[PDB]
Amino acid sequence: GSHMASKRALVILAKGAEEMETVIPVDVMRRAGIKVTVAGLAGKDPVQCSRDVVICPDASLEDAKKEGPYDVVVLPGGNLGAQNLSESAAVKEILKEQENRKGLIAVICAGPTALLAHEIGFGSKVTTHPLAKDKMMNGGHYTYSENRVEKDGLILTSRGPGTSFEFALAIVEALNGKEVAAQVKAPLVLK
Amino acid sequence: GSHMASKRALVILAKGAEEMETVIPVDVMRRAGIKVTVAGLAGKDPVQCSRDVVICPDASLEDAKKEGPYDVVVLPGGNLGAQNLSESAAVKEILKEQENRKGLIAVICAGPTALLAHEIGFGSKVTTHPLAKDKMMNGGHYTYSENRVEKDGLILTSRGPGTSFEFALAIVEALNGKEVAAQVKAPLVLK
């Protein structure tokens, strides 16, 4: 078929998610032509984020989970967002399936602690927000990195709001290649 | 009264606004303790942004306009967002009042072309997204800058999604001072 990759992303949006860490990847991936489904963890109703920005999901996770599999599953950070994701059986199942099928998992900031909660990617080199380091490293199930973006095979992690553009472009690069990522980067006026 | 500034921001959210350029300033200003009202240009219902992210306003502009004045009026970019803002009599009135009372106006990316439409801040040094330069400069009503953030008195402009953190921190600095801006910057993991 076509040499032009048509890819799909699942972004899981929980109450208390960091809104910048949600919107930057969604926007940047859509700029790349990735079909992104913003899926509300609890359901389809609008989601109150960490600084009270309210984002309306495209669908409930309930419904979006049925339209899998996805080329990447994306978890934003935010302490409460990460907590909610960590407590979710539905999220456990999706991550496990994604890992089982050798699909990309991309998580940022406090997000990676959801990987810890769900026993996903043990033994990976991972980064997190500096403040989430101890939580992530409790039990020594990973090797820690200070890299702004870290990609260890199909486990892609990043550090904070300030690494969100780099994180999103790394996802684009992994799904669609370097040239597509360069195209999307070009008008962003990034440093 | 208190030596600790309690400040208020009005962010005007139009259909087709750039969602990153909306959420980054809202989040960053709220991190600073600024009371931010995300006001929907057309009303209080959820607003579809440039890459289809849907953000629920705190209020209609109709209602928020009555709770003025604000310490800063913020206009995000996005071509369609900027167009809608440029066509709005309500926005014209708010900007004029803000300029008349020597209050801050902060605009990013395509956003500054709304200043042009409304004849706001003529003779200011301003920047825009590179692609919006010609539109902004039509009629020679401003002096152009390539600075990532440009502040000419009470007219603060910036270039794109990639300058959004710098733009938001500049607003924080203008309202609450350098130390508050440093506090907010510290955990962002910015380059």
Swiss-Prot record, chains A, B:
Report the locations given in the UniProt record.
Cell membrane; Cytoplasm; Nucleus; Membrane raft
Q: Which family does it belong to?
A: Belongs to the peptidase C56 family.
Put simply, this protein is called: Parkinson disease protein 7
List of residues that carry Cysteine sulfinic acid (-SO2H)? 109
Residues annotated as carrying Phosphotyrosine in the record are 70
Tell me which residues this entry annotates as catalytic: 109 (nucleophile), 129
| Residues with PTM N6-acetyllysine | 151
Q: What disorder is listed for this protein?
A: Parkinson disease 7: A neurodegenerative disorder characterized by resting tremor, postural tremor, bradykinesia, muscular rigidity, anxiety and psychotic episodes. PARK7 has onset before 40 years, slow progression and initial good response to levodopa. Some patients may show traits reminiscent of amyotrophic lateral sclerosis-parkinsonism/dementia complex (Guam disease).
Its induction note reads: By hydrogen peroxide and UV irradiation. In pancreatic islets, expression increases under hyperglycemic conditions. Expression is also induced by sulforaphane, an isothiocyanate obtained from cruciferous vegetables.
Q: Which Gene3D superfamilies match?
A: 3.40.50.880
Where does this protein come from, organism-wise? Homo sapiens (Human)
Cite the effect that the entry attributes to residue 54 to A.
Disrupts dimer formation and strongly reduces ability to eliminate hydrogen peroxide
InterPro entries per the record?
Class_I_gatase-like, DJ-1, DJ-1/PfpI, Prot/Nucl_acid_deglycase
What does this protein do, in the record's words? Multifunctional protein with controversial molecular function which plays an important role in cell protection against oxidative stress and cell death acting as oxidative stress sensor and redox-sensitive chaperone and protease. It is involved in neuroprotective mechanisms like the stabilization of NFE2L2 and PINK1 proteins, male fertility as a positive regulator of androgen signaling pathway as well as cell growth and transformation through, for instance, the modulation of NF-kappa-B signaling pathway.
N-acetylalanine modification, residue list: 5
Query: Residue positions of S-palmitoyl cysteine lipidation?
Result: 49, 56, 109
Outcome (variant: residue 109 to D)? Abolishes oxidation and association with mitochondria. No effect on chaperone activity
Site residues (Cleavage), renumbered to this chain: 152-153
The record, for NCBIfam families, names: not_thiJ
